[PDB]
Amino acid sequence: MKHHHHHHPMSDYDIPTTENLYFEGAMGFTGRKISLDFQDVEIRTILQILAKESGMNIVASDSVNGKMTLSLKDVPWDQALDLVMQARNLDMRQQGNIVNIAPRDELLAKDKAFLQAEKDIADLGALY
Numbered sequence: 454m455k456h457h458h459h460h461h462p463m464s465d466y467d468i469p470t471t472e473n474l475y476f477e478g479a480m481g482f483t484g485r486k487i488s489l490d491f492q493d494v495e496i497r498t499i500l501q502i503l504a505k506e507s508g509m510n511i512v513a514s515d516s517v518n519g520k521m522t523l524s525l526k527d528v529p530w531d532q533a534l535d536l537v538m539q540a541r542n543l544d545m546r547q548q549g550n551i552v553n554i555a556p557r558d559e560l561l562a563k564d565k566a567f568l569q570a571e572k573d574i575a576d577l578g579a580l581y
Contacts, residue, residue, distance in 0.1 A: 456468070456470060482529045482531040483508065483509070483529075483530075483531050484503075484506060484507060484508050484529050484530040484531050485506075485507070485529060485530075486527050486528060486529045487506060487525055487528060487529060487530050487533060488525055488526040488527060488528070489523070489524075489525055490523065490524040490525070491521075491522065491523045491524075492522045492523075492524070493520060493522060494520065494521065494522070494523075495518070495519065495520045495521075496517060496518070496519045496520060496521045496537060496540065496541060497513050497517045497518060497519070498513075499521065499523065499537055500513040500517065500537065500554045501513055503530045503533070503534055503537075506530050508530050508534075509547075509550045509551070509552055510550055510551040510552070511545070511551075511552050511553070511554055512551065512552070512553045512554070513553075513554045514553060514554060514555040514556065514559060516555065516556050516558065516559045517541070517543060517554055517555070517556055518541075518556075519540070519541045521537065521540050521541075523536075523537070538554075541556060542556065542557040542558075543555060543556050543557060544556075544557055544560050
């Protein structure tokens with residue numbers, strides 16, 4: 454809208470004067486704070502636990518291996534996910550509420566492999 458700029462009239466840097474739908478205490482994270490310990494637990498299982506903590510539907514890839522010790526207090530899985538993700542360098546492919554945790558290694562392997570597995574909507578490919 455013409456707030457100041459009627460050339461490129463979308464107020465980005467110009468600041469969007471947005472109507473407050475009561476943005477006072479409406480923040481939150483994706484998850485709740487978690488306090489838990491997982492000592493000598495495979496990281497693969499940890500990612501699954503984050504999903505089971507109402508943390509979307511995260512599918513840890515088969516190639517997510519390693520073992521890590523977490524001891525968390527007052528840390529939301531939002532934050533903890535980063536600590537975990539950085540520990541073997543993984544990444545997350547988010548498609549909807551289902552996200553896949555894949556190692557950065559497999560991301561690079563996916564570049565080498567076929568990117569477009571689907572060219573028609575037909576589900577085939579039992580064995581990779």
